[PDB]
């Protein structure tokens, strides 16, 4: 039932993800170190982490079949609006529900509710972020459906600023069809439709987590003392 094109798309996205996600987390050692107490002691470390993650998201996105065919303007608006969502999404592979934290190789690089607050955020964001990660874990997604979800998140025609919405929608359609077909090859109805519905809802959830992170980011980065601790790529991508 998975056509030749669908297996091909899936193989591409899996290779793109394995080329942009290091499960050894070896590069976390080159970030500014985590300081667990300026009540924003984790801001330098987590800023470097976010900056690193943006670069990984751009590398993944470039390998999405069809993304190259978009204009440069549409590639930029898609990555600017999607980046925080793909970061939250891809971070689930490091999320461990033992202690509701993101385990990234060691005790130093393990981030819990209070580590994120030490970068300036409140439970207004973190509480829905943790439950999002837990709900994602419950779904028990194949890596195949995970990378398809990240790609569908990026190529969305409803992002503000998108020029060629129809092309973007045509690219998303082929990824959507590919994921729907992968589910149907794996799960019979009605369970197949219940899973696809739970994944769509997670994309809706990321939109509202996006809006809430952006409001807190705008408040945090408005203080020059916080802006100073960010990185140039974060200020460019998350700003103007």
């Amino acid at each position: 039932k998975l056509s030749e094109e669908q297996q091909h798309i899936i193989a591409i996205l899996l290779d793109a993800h394995h080329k942009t996600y290091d499960p050894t987390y070896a590069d976390f050692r080159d970030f500014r170190p985590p300081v667990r107490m300026s009540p924003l002691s984790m801001l330098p470390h987590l800023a470097d982490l976010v900056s690193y993650s943006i670069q990984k998201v751009i590398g993944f996105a470039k390998m999405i079949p069809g993304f190259r065919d978009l204009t440069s303007d549409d590639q930029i608006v898609l990555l600017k609006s999607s980046a925080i969502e793909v970061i939250m999404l891809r971070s689930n592979q490091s999320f461990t529900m033992d202690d509701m934290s993101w385990d990234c190789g060691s005790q130093d690089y393990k981030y819990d509710v209070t580590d994120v607050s030490k970068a300036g955020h409140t439970l207004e964001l973190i509480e829905p972020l943790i439950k999002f990660q837990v709900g994602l874990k419950k779904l028990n997604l194949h890596e195949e459906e995970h990378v398809l979800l990240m790609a569908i998140c990026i190529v969305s025609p409803d992002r503000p600023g998108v020029q060629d919405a129809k092309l973007v929608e045509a690219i998303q359609d082929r990824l959507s069809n590919t994921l729907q077909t992968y589910i149907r090859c794996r799960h019979p109805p009605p369970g197949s439709h219940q899973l696809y519905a739970k994944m769509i809802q997670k994309l809706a959830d990321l939109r509202s987590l996006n809006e809430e992170h952006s409001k807190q980011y705008r408040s945090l980065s408005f203080q020059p003392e916080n802006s100073m601790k960010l990185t140039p790529l974060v200020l460019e991508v998350f700003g103007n």
Partner: peptide, 11 residues
């Protein structure tokens, strides 16, 4: 353009 570093990472 406003995004030279992102443009660069897109090459």
């Amino acid at each position: 353009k406003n995004h030279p570093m992102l443009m660069n990472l897109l090459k």
